[PDB]
Amino acid sequence: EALQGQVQHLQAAFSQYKKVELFPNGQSVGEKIFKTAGFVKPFTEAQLLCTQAGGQLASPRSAAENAALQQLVVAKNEAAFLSMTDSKTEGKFTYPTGESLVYSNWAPGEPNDAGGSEDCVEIFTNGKWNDVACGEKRLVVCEF
Amino acid sequence: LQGQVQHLQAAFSQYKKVELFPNGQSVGEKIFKTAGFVKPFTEAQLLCTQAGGQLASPRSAAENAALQQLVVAKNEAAFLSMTDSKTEGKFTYPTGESLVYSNWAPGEPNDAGGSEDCVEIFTNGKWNDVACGEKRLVVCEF
Amino acid sequence: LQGQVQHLQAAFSQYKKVELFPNGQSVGEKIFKTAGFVKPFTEAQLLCTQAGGQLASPRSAAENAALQQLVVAKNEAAFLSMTDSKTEGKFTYPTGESLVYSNWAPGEPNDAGGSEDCVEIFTNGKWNDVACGEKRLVVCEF
Numbered sequence A: 001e002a003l004q005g006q007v008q009h010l011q012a013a014f015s016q017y018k019k020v021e022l023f024p025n026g027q028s029v030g031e032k033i034f035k036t037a038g039f040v041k042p043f044t045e046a047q048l049l050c051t052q053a054g055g056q057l058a059s060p061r062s063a064a065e066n067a068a069l070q071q072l073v074v075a076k077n078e079a080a081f082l083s084m085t086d087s088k089t090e091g092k093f094t095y096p097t098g099e100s101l102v103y104s105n106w107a108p109g110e111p112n113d114a115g116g117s118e119d120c121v122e123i124f125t126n127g128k129w130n131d132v133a134c135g136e137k138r139l140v141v142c143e144f
Numbered sequence B, C: 001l002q003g004q005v006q007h008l009q010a011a012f013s014q015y016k017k018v019e020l021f022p023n024g025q026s027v028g029e030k031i032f033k034t035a036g037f038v039k040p041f042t043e044a045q046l047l048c049t050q051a052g053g054q055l056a057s058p059r060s061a062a063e064n065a066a067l068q069q070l071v072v073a074k075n076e077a078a079f080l081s082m083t084d085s086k087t088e089g090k091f092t093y094p095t096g097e098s099l100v101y102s103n104w105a106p107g108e109p110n111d112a113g114g115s116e117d118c119v120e121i122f123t124n125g126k127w128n129d130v131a132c133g134e135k136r137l138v139v140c141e142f
């Protein structure tokens, strides 16, 4: 009825604002949304900002999701932090839920745990991953 | 249709979260959002009103703390909407009513030089009456 | 349920307002949003298209004035979507149709050096055909 008309007018308007939101610091892949803050921070600060924002750090679980996140990295020309760490068990990277990686896109020779102190993961402009020290400043990208 | 509205709040709640990052803060049904730049009061008041809202007007300790976070993130003191321009010494909201909450810094308000009618909020959340001509961070509320 | 859906329009209308501040402008059913930075035409045109829209395409004085404010706010001339790349002298929208509105500055378009095929908009709302390789403000429309 009349209400049914109100909602279809709403999805129309909402879909337009979805597009407006993701410009220029957002990327949607499936039902997941990546958004970057535009600046660089250490892991702990990046993880904090993302969690208080109601989400978490970028967690690519597929090639499609990895490609979408990659576009933000290319656009900002800055390697970004991922949520996965091997702090608990060295060599074994896990999501915040604790489960093991269901997808990875390591660069050649990575992860190498360089200096025996590389426990966080970053993504380059080519979409490849590298384990890097969590104290380094990288692009803050959250997922919602 | 009944399912579609339930599907809609789900998407909207997600878009809600995406929107407020990283320049927004929600406290209750109020939303603080910063422009990222500094302006004199008249321009700040202007930009917020044309945007469909008004300058940041914290009415509780919770709201003041949320607004404070936007200030800390930008490392820039921000303008509030309240002024004692009409009646000196008595600061009021745009509606004209008196302050229902205040967090003045020690010794403030002092009306320094006899020409301080606007209010700014520091990175520590404390308030200070400052000249309206000064450039401070633009933070609106919606 | 009807109360629940109108409660949704209320929340969306608020987030509508939050979204457009401070880099957005809505005129009619069109939304202009700026990226805040400058890029060459091809890069600007690219960013807009992958974002789900296209470059700023003012079709009326009302739309042109709204786009103008983003330019004023950033103090940087912005690229429009219209070009005379196909047939020199004949500017067209991405759809291929001829201009239904123009606000050319005095003496424009002049195709200076025989190599000006893109259009920029100044802080005064006037248009100028300029070389597409130049870096201008990126403003898209949705």
Ligand SMILES: OC[C@H]1O[C@H](O[C@@H]2[C@@H](O[C@H]3[C@@H](O)[C@H](O)[C@@H](CO)O[C@@H]3O)O[C@H](CO)[C@@H](O)[C@@H]2O)[C@@H](O)[C@@H](O)[C@@H]1O
Pocket (backbone or CB within 6 Å): B108, B110, B112, B113, B116, B120, B128, B129, B130, B134
């Ligand atoms: O813009 C400088 C300073 O202004 C604000 O602090 C103010 C300052 O007053 C100064 C001076 O600005 C004023 O003209 C004379 C008038 O006799 O008094 C002082 O020399 O300091 C007082 C006391 O600390 C403040 O109450 C007053 O607001 C403030 O925005 C500050 O952040 C800023 O650097």
Ligand SMILES: OC[C@H]1O[C@H](O[C@@H]2[C@@H](O[C@H]3[C@@H](O)[C@H](O)[C@@H](CO)O[C@@H]3O)O[C@H](CO)[C@@H](O)[C@@H]2O)[C@@H](O)[C@@H](O)[C@@H]1O
Pocket (backbone or CB within 6 Å): C108, C110, C112, C113, C116, C120, C128, C129, C130, C131
């Ligand atoms: O980036 C410089 C200037 O570009 C735009 O104005 C252009 C400018 O043309 C130049 C030059 O390229 C041309 O060969 C000679 C012809 O006599 O004129 C100028 O030296 O100025 C003309 C007329 O003023 C414009 O039509 C032309 O677009 C513009 O973006 C401007 O803001 C900028 O400074």
Ligand SMILES: OC[C@H]1O[C@H](O[C@H]2[C@@H](O)[C@H](O)[C@@H](CO)O[C@@H]2O)[C@@H](O)[C@@H](O)[C@@H]1O
Pocket (backbone or CB within 6 Å): A110, A112, A114, A118, A122, A130, A131, A132, A133, A136
């Ligand atoms: O911060 C310097 C450097 O750190 C990272 O690369 C280091 C290491 O993690 C790699 O395994 C090796 C081999 O490629 O190179 C470095 O030692 C990267 O984040 C890199 O971009 C950065 O410059």
Ligand SMILES: [Ca+2]
Pocket (backbone or CB within 6 Å): A086, A090, A091, A113, A117, A118, A119, A120, A131
């Ligand atoms: Ca490790």
Ligand SMILES: [Ca+2]
Pocket (backbone or CB within 6 Å): A086, A087, A090, A116, A117, A118, A119
């Ligand atoms: Ca380790």
Ligand SMILES: [Ca+2]
Pocket (backbone or CB within 6 Å): A110, A111, A112, A113, A114, A118, A130, A131, A132
């Ligand atoms: Ca490494």
Ligand SMILES: [Ca+2]
Pocket (backbone or CB within 6 Å): B084, B085, B088, B114, B115, B116, B117
């Ligand atoms: Ca006074």
Ligand SMILES: [Ca+2]
Pocket (backbone or CB within 6 Å): B084, B085, B088, B089, B111, B115, B116, B117, B118, B129
């Ligand atoms: Ca005063």
Ligand SMILES: [Ca+2]
Pocket (backbone or CB within 6 Å): B108, B109, B110, B111, B112, B116, B128, B129, B130
């Ligand atoms: Ca004072």
Ligand SMILES: [Ca+2]
Pocket (backbone or CB within 6 Å): A021, B019, C019
């Ligand atoms: Ca936004």
Ligand SMILES: [Ca+2]
Pocket (backbone or CB within 6 Å): C084, C085, C088, C114, C115, C116, C117
């Ligand atoms: Ca030509």
Ligand SMILES: [Ca+2]
Pocket (backbone or CB within 6 Å): C084, C088, C089, C111, C115, C116, C117, C118, C129
């Ligand atoms: Ca031309």
Ligand SMILES: [Ca+2]
Pocket (backbone or CB within 6 Å): C108, C109, C110, C111, C112, C116, C128, C129, C130
């Ligand atoms: Ca010209």
